[PDB]
Structures are given as structure tokens and as C-alpha cells.
Paper text:
Aminoacyl-tRNA synthetases catalyze aminoacylation of tRNAs with their cognate amino acids in two stages. First, the amino acid is activated by ATP to yield the AMP-activated amino acid, with loss of pyrophosphate, followed by transfer of the amino acid onto the tRNA. Malaria parasite genomes encode two different lysyl-tRNA synthetases (KRSs) that play a role in translation in either the cytoplasm (PfKRS1) or in the apicoplast (PfKRS2), while Cryptosporidium parasites and humans encode one copy. We present a selective inhibitor of both Plasmodium and Cryptosporidium lysyl-tRNA synthetase capable of clearing parasites from mouse models of malaria and cryptosporidiosis infection.
Residue numbers in the entry:
A (entry chain B): 80 to 224, 226 to 227, 230 to 284, 287 to 439, 442 to 520, 538 to 582
B (entry chain A): 80 to 227, 230 to 282, 287 to 520, 538 to 582
The structure:
Amino acid sequence: PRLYFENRSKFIQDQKDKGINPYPHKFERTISIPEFIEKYKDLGNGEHLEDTILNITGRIMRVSASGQKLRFFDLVGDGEKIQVLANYSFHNHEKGNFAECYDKIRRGDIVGIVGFPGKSKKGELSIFPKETILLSACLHMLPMKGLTEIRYRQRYLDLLINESSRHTFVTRTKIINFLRNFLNERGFFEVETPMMNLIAANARPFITHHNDLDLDLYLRIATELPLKMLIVGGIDKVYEIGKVFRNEGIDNTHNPEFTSCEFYWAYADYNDLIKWSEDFFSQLVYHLFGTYKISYNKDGPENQPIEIDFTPPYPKVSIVEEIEKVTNTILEQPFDSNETIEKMINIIKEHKIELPPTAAKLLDQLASHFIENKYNDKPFFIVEHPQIMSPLAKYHRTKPGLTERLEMFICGKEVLNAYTELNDPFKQKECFKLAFCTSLEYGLPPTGGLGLGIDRITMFLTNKNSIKDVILFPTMRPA
Amino acid sequence: PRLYFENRSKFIQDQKDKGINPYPHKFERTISIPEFIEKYKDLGNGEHLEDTILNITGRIMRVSASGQKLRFFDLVGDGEKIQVLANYSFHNHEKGNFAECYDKIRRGDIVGIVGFPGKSKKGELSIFPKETILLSACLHMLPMKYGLTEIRYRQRYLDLLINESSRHTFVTRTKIINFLRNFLNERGFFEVETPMMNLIAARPFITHHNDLDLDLYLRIATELPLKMLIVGGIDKVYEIGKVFRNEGIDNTHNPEFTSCEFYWAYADYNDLIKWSEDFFSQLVYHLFGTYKISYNKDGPENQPIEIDFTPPYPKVSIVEEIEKVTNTILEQPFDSNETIEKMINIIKEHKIELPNPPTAAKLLDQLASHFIENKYNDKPFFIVEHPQIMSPLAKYHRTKPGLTERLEMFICGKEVLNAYTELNDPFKQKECFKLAFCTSLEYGLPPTGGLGLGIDRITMFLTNKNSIKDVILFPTMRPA
Ligand SMILES: O=C(NCC1(O)CCCCC1)c1cc(=O)c2cc(F)ccc2o1
Ligand SMILES: O=C(NCC1(O)CCCCC1)c1cc(=O)c2cc(F)ccc2o1
């Protein structure tokens, strides 16, 4: 129990009193474990290269049979594993006693080995030490291959023991890399805009204060506004990948701090944004898996997974038209009038459903219950949202009251939102009773903008049900 | 003035009253201005390709005429410029009246042109419109070329449109970050993201977390969680992102700035030195094709100096050098009342500003600033082997008691890099003798070398800027 730790702390001081440095300054290694494996995987059974002296390091993860003349361990590094074969025959007795030296070693210890490569008869690829030094001791018992809420609080344990953990976060990094190259290859320019600004939200802000300036500041909820200024400033294709903050409640698809990508693209229109969306997701998926088809456990690991097919193109569903269809209602314009409002409220009551109650929020609520689960076997776009839901989007060119907006869902979760910008400042409602507006007065070209939720995307592409599973150190009740 | 705006705004209304939308939905362009230049670069003077029709867009930055049947404009896009030559005979008269189609256009307007490519007689790459259309009006008067203060930092789009060099500055910023990302990734480093806010706490920003009812601290650095990933076996790890300091603001300090930190398992002191020398020499050669650059340290109105990034760079041992040049031994512990008074005395005698509070770390740092940092402007250099009291997370020097294996790089007296072997013995961890990170070490951190870079400051030196506000797109300021 806690006795383990204390005995191990005593070991550490004992070694020091005997003149052994259990945390040495430097150990020069000549080869990594993955490099070892790639270079020596093709030796014959029992084959041996005693003339090849190597320096290797790793974490002991298994302490096997004692055996007085033959010691066996597992040694891991960079998510890969080899065996350690300590044979009294090859041991350098000048540096210490064989049994004494290998007896001190416990699971989790990081070690530095000087030896040669080979396979055991049985066929196991091994490093054969002449000499083994402790580089950093593990003072606690590591959990074995069962593990609870400790994944999140001690992510390093999760990474060490759960093989799927490293895969998840490596996939995360590959996704962000892919997106960055994808955008760069299309001529896009990456910038950084402030994390701290002077505006609240409409989604509730983190607030802080710089005391030299005596100034309250707000963490950004999005990177929208200053990216659009850069478009005005002449940077015609422009983007940013980074954290945004929404001071809201936490759940499986919501974390208050999360990673977005937003881009703006001068002279792009609706179908460009659609095509960018379909090209991005299909190629990203193929890049990672070698197919457009993936398996996802929407309803947890204990239940059957479903297949999500990312083969383009993806379905497009007009929000109003589809609400009308499934509810057998006609939602007459403007969706403002308290008739249409009344109508939407009545739909809401009849079908359970909570609804404050407003024209835009009623529409959002109706869309949640009736549309956002239309497809689970493919991604799809909900498109042509009403202007009242979409104050920043350019008007639809043929359908009265609608916009050129598109919103992509995967298993009923929004991972993307895009639209053509409303660039006429005289049609822009917030410029009626009015920094953004001043931008538009200098001339914003026709521009398409798009945002991606990086964490939700990663969830789907790594088979996770909870956003906390794709964030290395999610913020938690200290408990 | 305000009149120009009011008049330009009535103009919009007037255009609409005539069936003309001044903010049309779409214009399909077929070529960008930079693509146009690359492709038609080699035309002869006066050569036209009347049969190539193209759709092009951009922003009008110059208006002039040669009578009423010949109009001349500068069109700019993606930082590059071509001429617009509207000739009466080439106009598509069916589409509208030539004079009143071109009379309306003003400096700042974004336009869509249908036309053919060619060079003017004088040799200027030009688009010759058949048809020219407003896509978005500029209702205000743009400041003239050479006439742009502090508007630059708020309304950065004005700065980007009027001052050619500012675009170049920020392009160079991005190239710098791209080089670093590639430099690390090619060496097997793995990029991650760690929390922007933590429970533990430089002087920090504070923010209230609504859902958990906590008051949290915005990160001042990414050190701790990156090291925990080392423990977790990600043996080469890094992060490029924002950190926040609730401190001062000046030419080298902004409340949020961009750092790169990495941790490198099994790396030592001279791995980090060689890394720094490789990185800076190669980054500079990549941007300039030489290791030497010009830098206006004392402002643009004075002569610049030359900074030579040719490796290796000098290493100066801080304590030894302070002692030497002040002919005064600093007896360990540097913490003692006696050595602190000794340091305060040296500071008093030399009329050097006393730090507040006058802790041993701050005294030593001030001493380094006054007696060492200033003397190497012609080259980057390292101050090394800092006392443990200055560097509580650094590993003990193998051979010099009291010191560490730390290195910190200066360019023209300004810190841009700080690196060291990590102390990994949890029993030598001063602040683990009274113990989330302390716990981490108990699971075993391998010997490790870590390093941080100050991306903004580096950009300043490589873009010849004296202020950090000129290398951040929106540096943080009062509303005024
Ligand atoms: O990935 C998300 N959303 C898709 C998207 O709206 C992001 C912005 C660019 C467009 C796509 C997402 C993840 C969250 O953890 C979250 C937490 C909140 F408190 C509120 C909203 C949130 O949203
Ligand atoms: O670039 C800087 N420093 C180099 C470095 O210390 C960064 C951390 C990794 C090591 C290198 C730097 C830039 C700032 O704007 C700044 C603002 C503050 F209020 C306080 C300190 C600041 O520091």
C-alpha cells in the first residue's frame, strides 16, 4: 500500500549512502527502442550480435523470472516494447554484483542499458545487457493493464499503461497537422489574434484583469472578428487554430476551454464552402484510415458500433423545410410574428421539449429534436438557416428570409459551421444602432467563413464518447 | 471628412435606387493578382492579349485619368499590384455608360473586372477592362501612402493596406513559426496542447470558472504539464501557444505572448546548446541566405548594427563573471544575509536600480543585466550556469556546487531563450520536501533537457523592429 512508497524512498537514500547516484545526470544512448526494433527485427532465432555494443533506455514494465543467472524484463519506449535478457554470462562483474544489481529493479523504473542485440531461442527480440543503471526510480506501484477517474487527473499513468491512450492523442496531433497542411497547400495564411479582448459574448465570458492597465479583459469566445479585419486588411485567405473559451456547463460534448479552427476566404461562395467541407473530411478520414468508412460506438463500448461513411458528397437538409415536413406544419414568414412563434411553441409542448422562448431559440430547439439525428451513418449538412438565426450570414439569393449557411453534423453533433458573410453594412442589423461595423465601412469583399470544432472531430475519429477523452489535461473539480 | 462618409453613403443608396447592387453576391474570378503577374511577367511593352478574357479582383489604391475616355488605376491583391487601363474602345457599352461606370470608382473600392491582360507602352503589367464592377465600397477616406500613429495597432487592417512593410513583417512571423514547427517535427518532436487555465500559480491573470465555482489562473508557462507528458512516455514533446503575464508593458513585454517550449528525454546541457545554435543559424540562413543581419537597435534614425548568427556563440558563466568584473566574491549560499547585503552594496556603489523586493535571485539578475547582458550586441550569446536559487526546477551542476546546468540566450541585451537539464530527483526538489507535479516526479521523470523560446522577441530581431507591438497583429491596449 503506502508502505511501498516509503520503502522505495528508503531505497533511494540507501543507494545514495552507498555512493550510488540513483538519478544520474547524463546517460548517452545510441539508439531508440523503435529504431532498435526496426533494425534488428529480422535476426534469426537465438541469433546474436555480440560485437554490436549499444546504449538503450526505457521504462521497465515487467519484472519476470529471477533465476540467479537469467533475468527477464519488458522495456518500453515511445509506445513500443522489447525484452531485456540479463544473462550472468555477459554481465560486467567489474561494475557490480549480478544478482544484487538486478534485484533492486522494480516495475516502472527507468533504466540505461549497455549491451548487444539478439533474439532468444524462443524468438524474442531482446537487448542483452552487460550493464544496467537506474536512471529514475518509480516510487509508487504502477497500476496494471484497471484504471478509473485517474486517467484525467494523472494522464501520464493513462499514457503509460493504456495502449489506446497514446494512439488517441497521436491521432489528435495528426488531425491538426493535416488540417494545417490542407489549408497551407490552398494558399491560406496562419495568424494569431488575441486570446484577451474587450467584449463579453452572447455565450458568457471568462473575465480577468490586467492590473498595470487597470483593465478588465475577456477571453475570446471565437476568432471571428479579428480574422475578418484581416480580410479587410488584404490578407485574403486567413486562418487560426487555437483555444476558445465559453464559460458554460460541462458535458460529454462541451468543455469550457476548447480548440477551434476558423478561416475566412475572400471571394468564396456557398458551394466553395461546401466543397471545402467535403474535400476536407473525406481526405482527412482516408489519410488516417485508408478508407472513408469508420466504426464508431455512439452508445458506449458495451453496445454495438455503427458505421459512419465519409464518402462524398454529403446530404444537405434545409432546416425550415425539414421541420415543416416532419411536424406537418407550415412555418410562415416572418418567423418573428407571434403566430409563427405561437405555432413553434405549440409544436414544442406537444412533443415534450423545453424551449427562454424566442424565434431563433425555438428554431434551434426544433432543429435539435427533429433534424440533427436525421443521419448517423454519414455526415450531413443542415443548410439555409433563417436570417433571424444567422445575423452575420449573407441572404439566400432565391429563398426569401433565408441565408447561405451550412452546418455539418456527425452523429447528431455539430462539428462545423460556415457561411457567406453579410458584407453590406446597411443590411447589417448591429450597424443599425452603431469596431466590426467600422471594418465593414472600409470595404469587406464577398467572403466565406468557416469554423471547425477540433475536439469533437477528434472524438469521432478516435472512437470517444466524451470530450475529456481527447483533451490531455481537462480542467476538473480538485475533489 | 465626416462629409466624405455621408456623401459616399448617399452614393450607395443612389446606386441601389438604380438597380445597381454595390455589394453583389458573387463574382467568379479566374485568377489572382499574384498569379496574373507570374503568368504575364514576360510580355513586351505595349503587347496585348486581346483574346484572352479573364476575371480578376482586387482593391483600388490609386485613381487618375487622361481625359474622359481613358482611366488609370492601381489594383492591389495579396500584397501585389497591377495597373488597370480602362480604354473607351474596349468597354462593353451595352453593360452601361463608360464615363459614369468609371467616374464612381474611388480609392479603396474593391472591384471585379472582366478584361484582357497586356503591358502598357511604358511597360506596366495591366488589366484592360471590358467591364468593371463594384464589389465592396470603401466609405471612408484611406490615409495616404506615408501618412499612418496608434490607429495602426487597433485598426491593423489600415496599417496592412497602407504600409507595405507591415504585411512583410507578419508574413515573416508566420515563416518563423513554420520553420520551428518543421525543425522540431523533423527531429521526432510531438506537438500537444495543455490547459490555458490552472489551479496553481510571474504574477498571474485570474479568472472565475462558472461551472466549477473556482477562481483559476491563466498559464504563465507550459513547463509543468509538458514534463508530465515526459513521465507518460512522450519523450520528445512541445507546444507553441499563448502564455499570459499580469505584469508590465513596454517595448519587449505584452500581456499575452507566444512561447515555444519543448522537453527532450535523455538530452543534456550540450544537446540544448547545440540545438539553439543549430536552430538560430539555420532559421536566419533560411530567411536571408546569410548568417549576418542588420538591426536598428537605437531606432531607425540611428545607424544599425550587424548581428552575426554564425555558430558557435559565446558562453559566459554568470557568477564567475559577476565576481570577476566586480572583484567581489559572492559566498554561497547566495541566499544568506551577508551575500545579499554584499550584492545590494555592489548595486548601491554602481548606482544600479534596486529590484524590489531585493531577493537574492533578483539581485543576481540585475547584476547580470548591468555587467554582462549589455556587452555582446554583434552576436547572440549564452549566460550559463545560473545559481540554483535562480532556477528551482533545474538540475544540479555536475561539478560546480550551488550552480545549475542552465543556459539563457540574449540577442542585443534581450532574453529570447531559456533552457536547462530538469531536476528530476523528487527528494532534491526544494518544494517537494513539503509536498500534482511533485507526484509526477515520484513516478519517475527520466533525465530530461527542456527549452523555451520567446517567439515574438525573435520576430522583432528578424524583422528589424524595436517594439513588440509591431510583431503582434493586435497588441493589447486600453480602449481610449
Ligand atoms: O466543437 C464545438 N462546436 C462546434 C463549433 O461550433 C465550434 C466553433 C466553430 C464552429 C464549430 C464545441 C465544443 C465545446 O466544447 C463547446 C463548449 C461550449 F461551452 C460551447 C460550445 C462548444 O462547442
Ligand atoms: O519573450 C519573452 N521572454 C522570453 C522567454 O522568457 C519566454 C518564455 C520561454 C523562455 C523565453 C517575453 C515576452 C513578453 O511579452 C513578456 C511579457 C511579460 F509581461 C513578461 C515576460 C515576457 O517575456
